[PDB]
Ligand binder design. Structure first.
Ligand SMILES: [K+]
Ligand SMILES: [K+]
Ligand SMILES: [K+]
Ligand SMILES: [K+]
Ligand SMILES: [K+]
Ligand SMILES: [K+]
Ligand SMILES: [Mg+2]
Ligand SMILES: [Mg+2]
Ligand SMILES: [Mg+2]
Ligand SMILES: [Mg+2]
Ligand SMILES: [Mg+2]
Ligand SMILES: [Mg+2]
Ligand SMILES: [Mg+2]
Ligand SMILES: [Mg+2]
Ligand SMILES: [Mg+2]
Ligand SMILES: [Mg+2]
Ligand SMILES: [Mg+2]
Ligand SMILES: [Mg+2]
Ligand SMILES: [Mg+2]
Ligand SMILES: [Mg+2]
Ligand SMILES: [Mg+2]
Ligand SMILES: [Mg+2]
Ligand SMILES: [Mg+2]
Ligand SMILES: [Mg+2]
Ligand SMILES: [Mg+2]
Ligand SMILES: [Mg+2]
Ligand SMILES: [Mg+2]
Ligand SMILES: [Mg+2]
Ligand SMILES: [Mg+2]
Ligand SMILES: [Mg+2]
Ligand SMILES: [Mg+2]
Ligand SMILES: [Mg+2]
Ligand SMILES: [Mg+2]
Ligand SMILES: [Mg+2]
Ligand SMILES: [Mg+2]
Ligand SMILES: [Mg+2]
Ligand SMILES: [Mg+2]
Lengths: 44, 50, 93, 64, 89
RNA sequence: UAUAGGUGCCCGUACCGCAAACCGACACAGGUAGUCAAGAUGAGAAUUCUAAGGUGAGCGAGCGAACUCUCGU
RNA sequence: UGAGUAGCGAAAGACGGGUGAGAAUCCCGUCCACCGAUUGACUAAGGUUUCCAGAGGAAGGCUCGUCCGCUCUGGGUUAGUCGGGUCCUAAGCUGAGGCCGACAGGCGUAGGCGAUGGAUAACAGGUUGAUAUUCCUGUACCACCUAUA
RNA sequence: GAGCUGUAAGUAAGCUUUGAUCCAGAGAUUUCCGAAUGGGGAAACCCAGCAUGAGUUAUGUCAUGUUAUCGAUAUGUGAAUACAUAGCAUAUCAGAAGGCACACCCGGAGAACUGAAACAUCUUAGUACCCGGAGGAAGAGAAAGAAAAUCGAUUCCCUUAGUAGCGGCGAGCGAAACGGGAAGAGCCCAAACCAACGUUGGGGUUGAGGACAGAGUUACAAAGGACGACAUUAGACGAAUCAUCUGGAAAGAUGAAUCAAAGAAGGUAAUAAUCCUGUAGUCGAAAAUGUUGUCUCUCUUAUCCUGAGUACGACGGAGCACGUGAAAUUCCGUCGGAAUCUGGGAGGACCAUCUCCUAAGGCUAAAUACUCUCUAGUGACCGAUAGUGAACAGUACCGUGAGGGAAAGGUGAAAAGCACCCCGGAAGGGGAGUGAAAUAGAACCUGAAACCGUGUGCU
């Protein structure tokens, strides 16, 4: 059966990547939250 | 624009705004004419219409 | 105050009352290695090798050059350079 | 080595920098072929380059 | 710059067969191009270069105990001489 | 309104890939775009047996009861 | 506890020889059988060293294991021409000025980014344990540079 | 002041009394991404233009510098269009961008569950969240005030007081002045009018005044110096115990001593004021940051006016403890709209009298708020299911993503971490050794219960 996750390097980077997060105010809020929590990984 | 309440007869309150009576007017800013939005109260209380 | 080559007396441990030369020092462990003190009998795989193990520096004491008594260490400033003086007598080491 | 480096001229220090870099590169090649056996020379030459670049940098800042 | 471009020689069975065929294999700085590699080899070893092939190697998974990480990424250059040879001993 | 000599960079290149390496928590009877397309039979890329090539499937040995399932009369 | 119970995930194996502490289960051989519009061959996505050689057998493998996509060590990916960039645009995204909007911001002009499309010069053979239109051999083509013309 | 090349063994090669490793101040270097800014981009990558310079016959390639956008400054080119303007080039500068503990603060905008035993006014609450702006604090602040005998900027603490009051007069909401305290500070403009070219300097700053007739870089104006002193950022000195016993080990027991401006606290083979690191006390800085002083240093010695689209009013809202109320007082939108010391505002509708004050300009330290931090310390706070989620982690793992989010400490005083022999491929054992102890052998202190076995006294 076809499952929900169909990985795609380009789609992953374009939707969840660092530059996409930077492009919006709320995305920069995401990055700030992860930096505050101390995450090793900030984005895709 | 300021913010306040619309109140019904039963005194129900809904948020609303009060907007200035802005009129687009040809004005001389910095010595060069331009069409800017200026309120009627300001126009009566002399920007400078050109 | 304890330095390699110094003659010291053991004041605590199995070798209490023994005397011997300070083989080595370990400042990070605050320990010293003294000749003929604290033999360990290690199993070596190339027999049984006898070697000294370190002891805590606070378990040995310098000996007085005059009265031979164990003495604590003070310091003076003879000719500028800091020098060691026995607290028992007052003479340099 | 800095005191001795400061006795050298400006053209000498550049020549020392070139010659030290060649020596270090020769050491790295010998290490990669298992021929070196004297691995403390590598750190010594690297720090000589650092000292040589420091003295050159001080002179230029001082003159400027 | 040339002695920075060239990092170390590579000694393997495949590299040794290449040396038998007059090809010399170097690990180079991961930022340099094959033209820089050719110039550096010519300058350092006073030889003539027929061609330079180049490739990249990804970081490799490596661990000791509980720590899993990666080795350094590599840039490998194979230099084909037309004139002369390079003595690695 | 030709010959002549010389130069030619970066990224990818391993391996799996209708799967034991991808998506399914699994060495999971599922899902996964395109290309190549042999012979006999035949309208055919259907059917059956084969070619090129690949595979014998990561528990077995007996027994040959009820019962269950899948088949034949 | 249930209990040495259910299950061990579609199917054809047999024997000889070898290795080994140990073999139904690994290697070699012979015969047999299964797919064959495919269980064959080649691209793409996706994965990311799983690839190769030697060594190993705790754990992983639904049994076993001398074996492995597992463990240890050391290796392996070669391009002017292949696919992409140094070319082009589509949807879409973005957008100097600009328009709009409590703020945050939304929209949009020129322009720009953007292949799933357009353009564009290399073939055959050989070779390794692991790469090959990339290495090698033979024979080409394209762009640019310099000299004779 | 003798070791040292991180954690961290392990060798290898070395460094260090001609002073290393280490510690503190000051410098140098400081790849790439990131506001990211030459252009692009799926962060840590790709692709360029100019100038300068290696190199090459030449190209290819390479090195340095520079090239974003909006802004300032001043030189040109310059539309429709005469002049101009917009626009387009250049040159110089480097002003903004983004981040945070952004905790506390100011502003914009602003819920709902909830309570009212239902619910709509009301409450939750101007709370959560979001957005903008800053500082070490912010905000407020020098009376058109509080008041009714007078006080004299603001802020904060106590009290007034759960009072006065507000309120489907329900649920609830809820002051202030007086009094007592912390702290304490006051000033600059606009205008009358003068002298120079409406703009500049002088003039002036208030409850009646004005026109007219020694102080300071903490506001009140802003730049430096000279020197001193103190503090922080490394450090130094620093009193006094020996013996026996048990023990593997003494600090314990016993005996006999000693020091104390030092009997805080850790460590040391068990429990140490005198063994060590220290403590009381005392000393110390090449350099850099701070604080604070003296000298210097400068700055200085009712004729007229007094804040106008204002005050104020009507309508619609909001803030005031206060829900439109008898609602004063403050603010916003719309529209109207004064007076000019014989003036104007307030004293809870309003009028009169009286009393107090002088709006429509600005600045202003301190007492106050907070803690990711740093330094020094504290606890009838935790002690590994506790205490941080985290004593070894925002990791592993889960999720497309926002996001969620563990488990896991202890040999021994000292590795002395079991030479060697034997069975075994190994694993694992039995000896022998080390150790005070190995049922302390690393899956290592203690080793409960469930649970699983072996033997058997009675049955
Ligand atoms: K049976
Ligand atoms: K790929
Ligand atoms: K606020
Ligand atoms: K209720
Ligand atoms: K004036
Ligand atoms: K009203
Ligand atoms: Mg390549
Ligand atoms: Mg391949
Ligand atoms: Mg996988
Ligand atoms: Mg499958
Ligand atoms: Mg399938
Ligand atoms: Mg399909
Ligand atoms: Mg068929
Ligand atoms: Mg299977
Ligand atoms: Mg059971
Ligand atoms: Mg049975
Ligand atoms: Mg049963
Ligand atoms: Mg049964
Ligand atoms: Mg069964
Ligand atoms: Mg099976
Ligand atoms: Mg197939
Ligand atoms: Mg393999
Ligand atoms: Mg098994
Ligand atoms: Mg492997
Ligand atoms: Mg747009
Ligand atoms: Mg292959
Ligand atoms: Mg950039
Ligand atoms: Mg950009
Ligand atoms: Mg901030
Ligand atoms: Mg209710
Ligand atoms: Mg002392
Ligand atoms: Mg009034
Ligand atoms: Mg006034
Ligand atoms: Mg416990
Ligand atoms: Mg915990
Ligand atoms: Mg025990
Ligand atoms: Mg135990």
């Amino acid at each position: 059966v076809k499952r929900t996750y169909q990985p795609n390097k380009r789609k992953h980077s374009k939707v969840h990547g660092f530059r996409k997060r930077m492009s919006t105010k709320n995305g920069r809020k995401v990055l700030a939250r992860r930096r505050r929590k101390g995450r090793k990984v900030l984005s895709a | 624009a300021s913010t306040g309440n619309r109140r019904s007869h039963a005194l129900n309150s809904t948020k609303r705004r009060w907007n200035a009576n802005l009129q687009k007017v040809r004005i001389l800013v910095d010595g060069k004419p331009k069409k800017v939005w200026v309120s009627a109260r300001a126009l009566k209380s002399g920007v400078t219409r050109v | 105050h304890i330095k390699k080559g110094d003659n010291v007396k053991v004041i605590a441990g199995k070798d209490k009352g023994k005397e011997g030369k300070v083989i080595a020092t370990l400042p990070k462990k605050d320990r010293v290695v003294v000749e003929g003190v604290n033999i360990m009998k290690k199993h070596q795989k190339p027999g049984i090798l006898e070697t000294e193990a370190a002891i805590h520096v606070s378990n040995v004491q310098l000996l007085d050059p005059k009265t031979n008594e164990p003495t604590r260490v003070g310091y003076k400033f003879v000719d500028g350079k800091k020098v060691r003086i026995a607290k028992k007598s007052g003479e340099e080491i | 080595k800095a005191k001795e480096i400061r006795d050298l001229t400006t053209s000498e220090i550049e020549e020392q920098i070139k010659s030290s870099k060649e020596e270090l590169f020769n050491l790295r090649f010998q290490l990669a072929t298992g021929q070196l056996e004297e691995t403390a020379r590598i750190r010594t030459v690297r720090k000589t380059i650092a000292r040589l670049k420091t003295v050159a940098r001080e002179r230029e800042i001082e003159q400027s | 710059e040339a002695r920075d471009i060239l990092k170390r020689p590579v000694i393997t069975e495949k590299s040794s067969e290449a040396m038998a065929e007059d090809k010399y294999t170097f690990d180079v700085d991961t930022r340099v191009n094959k033209t820089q590699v050719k110039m550096a080899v010519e300058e350092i070893f006073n030889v003539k270069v027929a061609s330079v092939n180049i490739m990249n190697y990804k970081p490799k998974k490596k661990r000791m105990g509980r720590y899993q990480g990666y080795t350094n990424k590599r840039r490998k250059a194979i230099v084909t001489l037309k004139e002369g040879s390079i003595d690695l001993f």
